Ligand SMILES: CC[C@H](C)[C@H](NC(=O)[C@H]1CCCCN1C)C(=O)N(CCCCC(C)C)[C@H](C[C@@H](O)c1nc(C(=O)N[C@@H](Cc2ccc(F)cc2)C[C@H](C)C(=O)O)cs1)C(C)C
Ligand SMILES: Nc1nc2c(ncn2[C@@H]2O[C@H](COP(=O)(O)OP(=O)(O)O)[C@@H](O)[C@H]2O)c(=O)[nH]1
């Protein structure tokens with residue numbers, strides 16, 4: 001047992017979090033009641049990483065569902081896998097947060113946060129050896145961004161020596177039309193730079209473009225977006241959930257992926273890209289998985305990898321395949337494209353292979369890159385932010401909850417510093 | 429230090445909301461007082477002018493009786 005405590009906050013957080021639990025429960029042979037019905041002991045060896053074990057041989061997700069409104073969590077409770085979660089772990093208010101980071105972080109979210117922490121405390125005390133915490137949330141809304149970062153800060157105070165992991169969904173004008181999302185995102189990124197060890201940048205711009213351009217879905221839904229998020233989430237946690245060699249826990253992942261503390265924002269990738277139902281009958285070859293997982297068109301952050309250099313990379317292949325052929329293909333990628341891998345971190349690409357593929361596929365590959373190209377994502381937020389902030393536009397929604405402009409200036413500064421920091425290492 | 433700042437923000441929000449209620453209440457009190465005394469002053473002058481007509485109307489009737 002090296003236990004991870006999962007928290008999901010706000011609409012987006014609870015929606016992609018719900019889907020994560022559906023996917024990994026199916027991969028571990030857990031059904032909606034928490035009963036094991038699998039045909040392989042590999043499924044149970046490291047089940048305690050994500051599931052508590054109750055009497056009756058029942059597995060309960062180590063999952064805390066947080067929100068400031070009840071709508072999304074009634075949707076989760078009423079859903080197919082909803083009966084799996086511990087009922088006292090649903091912690092919710094009635095107010096909502098109005099897509100306002102100040103309300104989530106300082107006023108509405110303050111009132112609820114100590115009852116979330118009581119559930120986190122209970123789950124933590126029950127762990128033989130807690131690794132740390134993983135949070136799912138968006139950065140563009142109110143609850144997930146504002147209250148979610150408040151939670152990160154409180155958890156860090158109680159558990160300063162555990163790993164803090166996030167799946168942070170970045171806002172795009174292709175998906176949302178709320179004008180203040182760059183404000184909420186910039187404030188939330190300021191928090192993530194200081195208080196997380198590892199952040200997966202799931203960018204809605206990338207998710208939309210993949211669905212539109214590549215998957216040929218002319219009117220994508222959130223479900224279409226989330227199907228790519230859950231695949232990625234299944235993929236990047238494989239090393240934590242099955243035996244057992246490379247990046248097998250959160251701290252070991254961090255020591256491999258994070259050469260400087262502030263530069264802990266990752267650019268995930270996935271192959272093959274699929275839409276729901278629409279069937280992959282043809283399995284990919286090892287050469288195609290390797291070409292596709294490094295392709296710009298397969299990144300979940302809308303950044304051009306050729307515009308930066310890779311500091312560190314984790315590649316994780318799933319299914320029954322030739323380990324020899326994986327090794328050849330991985331070496332081939334870094335030898336043919338050697339100038340995109342910083343010379344000053346030797347052997348910065350590490351490779352894992354898990355024998356069990358995901359649902360509906362024989363072969364998959366998941367890419368996790370710490371590239372300096374991720375500055376393009378932050379730079380996009382910064383430009384959207386500065387356009388409004390130079391005229392103090394929409395700032396009354398934030399100052400009316402007691403914030404000062406100085407908080408905005410500091411957050412603007414820290415993110416622009418992050419950008420220049422990435423450019424520093426891109427030119428060394 | 430971050431926990432003390434979170435506290436300060438929520439107190440600022442409460443204080444500005446309370447100051448807004450206060451000023452609305454003071455500004456409305458001084459407006460209504462100012463209006464009442466202004467309107468009483470306008471009616472007082474109206475009737476004090478009508479009472480000067482009654483003093484003049486008796487001077488006219490007494491001036492008649494001083495032609496006897
Ligand atoms: C007529 C508005 C449509 C709905 C909207 N278009 C826009 O916002 C355009 C218009 C103008 C300028 C550019 N913007 C982006 C749109 O297509 N949206 C997002 C905005 C919804 C916000 C308000 C109107 C509710 C898409 C998502 C939208 O179609 C929805 N999907 C779902 C959805 O996924 N529902 C699932 C359940 C679910 C509910 C809520 C969730 F948050 C997630 C999943 C069930 C379905 C059957 C499924 O799995 O496909 C609910 S609403 C984005 C991908 C662009
Ligand atoms: N990919 C994805 N994005 C979402 C989903 N729901 C909301 N968002 C995005 O999240 C942002 C708003 O945050 P939301 O989670 O709804 O607000 P909260 O309830 O206050 O945390 C917008 O940029 C939305 O496009 C979802 O189910 N999937």
Ligand SMILES: [Mg+2]
Pocket residue numbers: 011141
């Ligand atoms: Mg919402």
